[PDB]
Design a protein around this ligand. Structure first.
Ligand SMILES: [Cl-]
Length: 271
């Protein structure tokens, strides 16, 4: 409004702050990645959550976090809310494969309208605001001490999708064990498309790859939680893509009674 842009900035600020907390643990030679209350993962997720809510609690909108303490009855009346996963990609983190993410979405009337994904190891930030665009900012660790604004972030970032035409079809999969349902769909894609390539990336980067134009489709026929898709879904939408409920024409919906997502497919917005 006069306020939406400031909320977007808050999400970016929060994601970077969380990123710092996570990376400090990830990079610490004293961290014991063989460890639970005192596991590196548990501590990082908690510190990330704390960094994020320190900012988001100040905003006018309530917070639904993966690391937060609540009943559906409480949140069912929240028309606008933050949906957050402070640290997605458990295996990426604990096995030190490096493609874990911070995920912050603003959801309004069950639709993700702003999203931020930060990839702390890679210092890659994706963000989007419905009606403005989706953007990628590479090489960012934190904000300057002075002068930083959303308008400046947008100016300095790359609008998505990023232009590079290719004549071949690309699908993206997890680096973890794929479900037989996902593998079956991919097998069918491989039969349908003569010039097919598969690529893989951690966490919600898979949604980002479609938004970037680096992949045509990200099918996930596996259980995931709202907080792991919401941010990427906002980003996808602002890039001309969509995150469909697999087998339906309807996008994934949010702030549901059950926070599990159904199967989804990220692809270009249909006709
Ligand atoms: Cl899968």
């Amino acid at each position: 409004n006069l306020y939406f842009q400031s909320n977007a900035m808050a999400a970016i600020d929060a994601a970077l702050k969380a990123g710092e907390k996570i990376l400090s643990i990830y990079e610490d030679p004293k961290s014991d990645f063989e460890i639970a209350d005192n596991s590196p993962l548990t501590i990082a997720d908690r510190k990330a959550h704390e960094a994020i809510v320190a900012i988001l609690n100040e905003t006018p909108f309530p917070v639904l976090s993966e690391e937060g303490k609540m009943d559906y009855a409480v949140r069912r009346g929240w028309d606008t809310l933050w949906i957050v996963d402070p640290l997605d990609g458990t295996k990426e983190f604990i096995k030190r494969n490096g493609e874990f993410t911070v995920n912050i979405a603003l959801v309004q009337n069950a639709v993700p309208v702003m999203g931020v994904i930060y990839v702390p190891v890679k210092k890659e930030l994706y963000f989007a605001v419905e009606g403005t665009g989706a953007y990628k900012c590479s090489g960012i660790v934190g904000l300057e001490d002075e002068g930083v604004t959303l308008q400046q972030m947008i100016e300095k970032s790359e609008r998505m999708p990023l232009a590079d035409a290719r004549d071949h079809f690309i699908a993206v999969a997890s680096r973890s064990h794929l479900t037989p349902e996902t593998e079956t769909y991919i097998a069918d894609l491989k039969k349908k498309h003569g010039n097919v390539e598969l690529i893989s990336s951690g966490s919600s980067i898979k949604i980002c790859l479609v938004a970037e134009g680096k992949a045509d489709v990200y099918p996930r026929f596996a259980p995931t939680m709202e907080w792991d898709t919401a941010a990427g879904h906002a980003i996808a939408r602002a890039a001309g893509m969509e995150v469909y409920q697999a087998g339906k024409e309807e996008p994934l919906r949010y702030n549901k009674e059950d926070l599990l997502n159904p199967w989804f497919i990220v692809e270009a917005k249909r006709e």
